Structure formats: structure tokens, C-alpha cells
Design a protein around this ligand. Structure first.
Ligand SMILES: O=C(c1ccc(Nc2nc3ccccc3n3nnnc23)cc1)N1CCOCC1
Ligand SMILES: [Zn+2]
Length: 203
């Protein structure tokens, strides 16, 4: 029972979500190899994801975590990129989405940099790029990211099961790079906004 509601570009919600997406683009150490070369996006659509089952599942787990962490869920809004967006918005996050080869163990990874999430849209390392042109830097084909509500709780600061007494891991990666986060329970993230976009070729 997932439905998707389109937001008007005149909606404050559309504008705040776009701004978060645009303002967290950075340059990457791969020179654009995985996610492409761009400074900004063309946002084409932003849809609100509404699923009562997945939400109650999220808030139930949020309450648990909160009570184990001095009444502090440590809830963030973070980006996630994946080939399986469609599965996520209907079935939610689960152990099948655990990135076994990730630097912080077999969990689900999120990012403050939208452009880091962009690198995983066509798979790990950008895969073979867009299905139509096999171009990881394609300026034509439409991409999709998720902007997710994420419960971090007590997060282990790093410079499958979570670390003992901790509900998530914070990776603190470079001075301009923002944090990346890992959760080990699928119930600790809710896929709230689905964003459709293109990367833009710099002028
Ligand atoms: O295709 C994927 C996969 C991998 C990574 C992300 N998403 C992200 N990975 C990140 C890794 C490191 C740092 C940040 C990452 N990130 N930010 N946003 N999304 C990701 C999705 C699917 N998998 C294969 C099937 O089983 C599950 C794993
Ligand atoms: Zn393409």
C-alpha cells in the first residue's frame, strides 16, 4: 500500500528538499568516474512516499532506540542511491539491501552528500552507467534518489549486527566530504521523498 504524491514546485516542501539536494553536491576523489561530472542537478520531480505499514514499522523502532539513548532518536534526513529504489519504496529497507562490501560492515549506507548517493544510482561504483548509453556520466537519462528519515540513535564514530550498545555507525571521511552513515536494521529508515533528476553538464 505505497502511494506517491507529486509535490508542486511552488510547495515549500519541494523547494526545501531541492535545496538540500543541490547544496550538498561536492567534488569526488574519483573525478566523476562513478557518478559523473557535474556541479548541480536538474530536478524533474519530487514525490512524497506514503506507506502506513512502513511508517509505523519505522516509528515503532524509533521509539525503542530513543528509550535506549536518553530519549534521543538522533533522527536525520539523508540520501540513499540504489538500483532497487522501486523495491525500497514498496517493501522498505531490509537485509537484502545490506552492502556486504561496505567500509563499515554489512549494513545499509546513507549520505549527507547527495552526490555520494548519486554514485550508487546505477550500482556499486556507478556500475556500467545508464542502461541506455552505458554512460556513468549520462546527462540525458533520468536518475532517482531517495531522501530518507533515518534513526541513528547512539552512533559509533568510525575514523550483520551493529557495534555493541550502538544503533548505527558514523563514517567521518578530505575536509569538504560530509558524513556517511550505516544502519543494520531496515526498520531504522523510512524512504520519504523520491527525487527524479538529471545531472547537469557544467558550462
Ligand atoms: O547494489 C547494491 C547497493 C550498494 C550500495 C548502495 N548505496 C550506497 N552505498 C554507499 C556506500 C558507501 C558510502 C555511501 C553509500 N551510499 N550513500 N547513499 N547510498 C549509498 C545501494 C545499493 N547492493 C547489492 C545488493 O545487496 C545490497 C548492496
Ligand atoms: Zn543515458
Amino acid at each position: 500500500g505505497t502511494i506517491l504524491i507529486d509535490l508542486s514546485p511552488d510547495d515549500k516542501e519541494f523547494q526545501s528538499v531541492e535545496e538540500e539536494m543541490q547544496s550538498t553536491v561536492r567534488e569526488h576523489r574519483d573525478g566523476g568516474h562513478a557518478g559523473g561530472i557535474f556541479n548541480r542537478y536538474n530536478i524533474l520531480k519530487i514525490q512524497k512516499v506514503c506507506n502506513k505499514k512502513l511508517w509505523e514499522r519505522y516509528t515503532h523502532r524509533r521509539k525503542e532506540v530513543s528509550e535506549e539513548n536518553h530519549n534521543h532518536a538522533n533522527e536525520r534526513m539523508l540520501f540513499h542511491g540504489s538500483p532497487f529504489v522501486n523495491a525500497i519504496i514498496h517493501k522498505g529497507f531490509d537485509e537484502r539491501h545490506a552492502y556486504i562490501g561496505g567500509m563499515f560492515g554489512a549494513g545499509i549506507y546513507f549520505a549527507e552528500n547527495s552526490s555520494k548517493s548519486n554514485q550508487y544510482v546505477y550500482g556499486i561504483g556507478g556500475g556500467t552507467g545508464c542502461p541506455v548509453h552505458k554512460d556513468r556520466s549520462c546527462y540525458i537519462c533520468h536518475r532517482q534518489l531517495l531522501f530518507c528519515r533515518v534513526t541513528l540513535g547512539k552512533s559509533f564514530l568510525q575514523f550483520a549486527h551493529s557495534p555493541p550498545g550502538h544503533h548505527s555507525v558514523t563514517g567521518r571521511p578530505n575536509g569538504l566530504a560530509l558524513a556517511e552513515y550505516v544502519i543494520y536494521r531496515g526498520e531504522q529508515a523510512y524512504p520519504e521523498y523520491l527525487i527524479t533528476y538529471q545531472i547537469m553538464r557544467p558550462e
